[PDB]
Design an enzyme around this catalytic site. Structure first.
Site, PDB file in Angstrom:
ATOM      1  N   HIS A 181     -39.245 -25.898 -40.784  1.00 33.02           N
ATOM      2  CA  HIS A 181     -40.400 -26.499 -41.386  1.00 33.02           C
ATOM      3  C   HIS A 181     -41.651 -25.908 -40.811  1.00 33.02           C
ATOM      4  O   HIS A 181     -41.644 -25.237 -39.779  1.00 33.02           O
ATOM      5  CB  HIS A 181     -40.318 -28.033 -41.211  1.00 33.02           C
ATOM      6  N   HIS A 197     -40.657 -23.170 -37.836  1.00 36.06           N
ATOM      7  CA  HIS A 197     -39.863 -23.365 -36.633  1.00 36.06           C
ATOM      8  C   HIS A 197     -38.763 -24.381 -36.902  1.00 36.06           C
ATOM      9  O   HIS A 197     -38.803 -25.154 -37.851  1.00 36.06           O
ATOM     10  CB  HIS A 197     -40.758 -23.873 -35.484  1.00 36.06           C
ATOM     11  N   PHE A 226     -49.516 -24.564 -38.350  1.00 33.04           N
ATOM     12  CA  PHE A 226     -48.391 -24.236 -37.452  1.00 33.04           C
ATOM     13  C   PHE A 226     -47.308 -23.584 -38.255  1.00 33.04           C
ATOM     14  O   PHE A 226     -46.945 -24.050 -39.341  1.00 33.04           O
ATOM     15  CB  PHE A 226     -47.824 -25.480 -36.774  1.00 33.04           C
TER      16      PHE A 226
HETATM   17  C1  LIG Z   1     -43.853 -29.602 -36.449  1.00 26.28           C
HETATM   18  C2  LIG Z   1     -44.666 -28.866 -35.326  1.00 26.28           C
HETATM   19  C3  LIG Z   1     -45.561 -27.765 -35.901  1.00 26.28           C
HETATM   20  C4  LIG Z   1     -45.471 -29.830 -34.424  1.00 26.28           C
HETATM   21  N1  LIG Z   1     -44.558 -30.395 -33.452  1.00 26.28           N
HETATM   22  C5  LIG Z   1     -43.557 -29.586 -33.077  1.00 26.28           C
HETATM   23  O1  LIG Z   1     -42.419 -29.563 -33.618  1.00 26.28           O
HETATM   24  C6  LIG Z   1     -44.039 -28.555 -32.058  1.00 26.28           C
HETATM   25  C7  LIG Z   1     -43.075 -27.418 -31.750  1.00 26.28           C
HETATM   26  C8  LIG Z   1     -43.908 -26.325 -31.033  1.00 26.28           C
HETATM   27  S1  LIG Z   1     -45.640 -26.795 -30.770  1.00 26.28           S
HETATM   28  N2  LIG Z   1     -44.473 -29.225 -30.831  1.00 26.28           N
HETATM   29  C9  LIG Z   1     -44.010 -28.931 -29.610  1.00 26.28           C
HETATM   30  O2  LIG Z   1     -42.842 -28.609 -29.395  1.00 26.28           O
HETATM   31  C10 LIG Z   1     -44.996 -29.093 -28.476  1.00 26.28           C
HETATM   32  C11 LIG Z   1     -44.811 -30.413 -27.738  1.00 26.28           C
HETATM   33  C12 LIG Z   1     -43.546 -30.472 -26.834  1.00 26.28           C
HETATM   34  C13 LIG Z   1     -44.036 -31.223 -25.632  1.00 26.28           C
HETATM   35  N3  LIG Z   1     -45.153 -30.442 -25.099  1.00 26.28           N
HETATM   36  C14 LIG Z   1     -42.739 -31.349 -24.793  1.00 26.28           C
HETATM   37  O3  LIG Z   1     -42.527 -30.429 -23.937  1.00 26.28           O
HETATM   38  O4  LIG Z   1     -41.966 -32.231 -25.006  1.00 26.28           O
HETATM   39  C15 LIG Z   1     -46.674 -29.161 -33.779  1.00 26.28           C
HETATM   40  O5  LIG Z   1     -46.675 -28.954 -32.455  1.00 26.28           O
HETATM   41  O6  LIG Z   1     -47.605 -28.844 -34.510  1.00 26.28           O
HETATM   42 FE   LIG Z   2     -41.577 -29.505 -35.843  1.00 26.26          FE
END
Ligand SMILES: CC(C)[C@@H](NC(=O)[C@H](CCS)NC(=O)CCC[C@H](N)C(=O)O)C(=O)O
Ligand SMILES: [Fe+3]
Length: 325
Positions: free
Chosen positions: A268, A212, A209
């Site tokens: 990150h 962001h 990923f």
């Molecule tokens: C650190 C990041 C890469 C990890 N979690 C996140 O920060 C990422 C950001 C974009 S996917 N996750 C997400 O933001 C997706 C989940 C949000 C959920 N569907 C909601 O709407 O509350 C991930 O999705 O892999």
């Molecule tokens: Fe994140």
């Protein structure tokens, strides 16, 4: 190669009690971490993370392809137009390795006023069959409340850190209306691992990923003991050490807005690692109409030239933009 990021371990247990000076000393540690790399590990948090990981593993390894379609968000299943956030996010073998299951506030029931109104970002959770996944829905809903409680305590610490009364954020973080989400993410081991499922950073680092900032107030994360996260600092990207006893905490871009970037949302990214592991974030969101007036703890009068932004507006706009990026 890559330096280790400064990610302190903070004993957050005083934030659950009534010793005010001890809570101030925790708040200072949160302030320091938030001004430095933007990450810390919360320890002595009270949550049974080993049982969390076991219950989540029993889900991920038993769910079937049939059930995934039946739970799928609208991006994967056109029949499920009400499922934007909550449900199953499928892998695409050969192309997209990660898969996940997201759920929202268990209080978003069919009779909830925001569900009746069809207000954006509010949905009723979907769950697999009880007989196929015994105990899973009950476990997962209780987990929501366990990590809500930890998050409320952490928000008291952030409030004190910023010079505010301890309910400054927590008064907007309420069981009846929080937009907070849990995501149960499975990163697979694959042999061979398809290159199409691996991204490449400008510095050559292989990623699952890309860079962001989080769409959250704060993010409260439990992960397996497999190193993978990196944080951008003035010294470049640095590795965040793993610790599967603690919760890894960071600010999201709503905190950065509120504080005029005094507490930045750290940038990150997730390194590609060919390992079967879990990543279980809780995105701490406020209510749809929650608005906190922006301020600046570096300015004597505390005034900021940012405009107030409702959390619902923030979250709708953010979830889309992160999808786009
Ligand atoms: C650190 C990041 C890469 C990890 N979690 C996140 O920060 C990422 C950001 C974009 S996917 N996750 C997400 O933001 C997706 C989940 C949000 C959920 N569907 C909601 O709407 O509350 C991930 O999705 O892999
Ligand atoms: Fe994140």
């Amino acid at each position: 190669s890559v330096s280790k990021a400064n990610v302190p371990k903070i004993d957050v247990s005083p934030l659950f009690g009534d010793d005010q000076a001890a809570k101030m000393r925790v708040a200072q540690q949160i302030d320091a971490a938030s001004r430095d790399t933007g990450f810390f590990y919360a320890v002595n948090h009270g949550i049974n993370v080993q049982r969390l990981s076991q219950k989540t593993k029993e889900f991920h390894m038993s769910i079937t392809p049939e059930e995934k379609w039946d739970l799928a968000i609208r991006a994967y299943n056109k029949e499920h137009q009400d499922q934007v956030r909550a449900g199953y996010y499928l892998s695409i073998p050969g192309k997209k390795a990660v898969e996940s299951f997201c759920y929202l506030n268990p209080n978003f029931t069919p009779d909830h006023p925001r569900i009746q109104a069809k207000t954006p970002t509010h949905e009723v959770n979907v769950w697999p069959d009880e007989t196929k996944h015994p105990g899973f829905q009950d476990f997962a809903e209780q987990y929501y409340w366990d990590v809500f409680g930890l998050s409320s305590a952490l928000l008291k610490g952030y409030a004190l850190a910023l010079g505010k009364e301890e309910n400054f954020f927590a008064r907007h973080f309420k069981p009846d209306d929080t937009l907070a989400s849990v995501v149960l993410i499975r990163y697979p081991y694959l042999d061979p691992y398809p290159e199409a499922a691996i991204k490449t950073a400008a510095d050559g680092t292989k990623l699952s990923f890309e860079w962001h900032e989080d769409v959250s107030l704060i993010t409260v994360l439990y992960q397996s003991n497999v190193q993978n996260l990196q944080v951008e600092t003035a010294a470049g990207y640095q590795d965040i050490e793993a610790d599967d006893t603690g919760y890894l905490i960071n600010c999201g871009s709503y905190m950065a807005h509120l504080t005029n970037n005094y507490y930045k949302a750290p940038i990150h990214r997730v390194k590609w690692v060919n390992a079967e592991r879990q990543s279980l974030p809780f995105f701490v969101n406020l209510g749809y109409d929650s608005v906190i007036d922006p301020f600046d703890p570096r300015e004597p009068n505390g005034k900021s030239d940012r405009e107030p932004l409702s959390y619902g507006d923030y979250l709708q706009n953010g979830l889309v933009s992160l999808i786009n990026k």
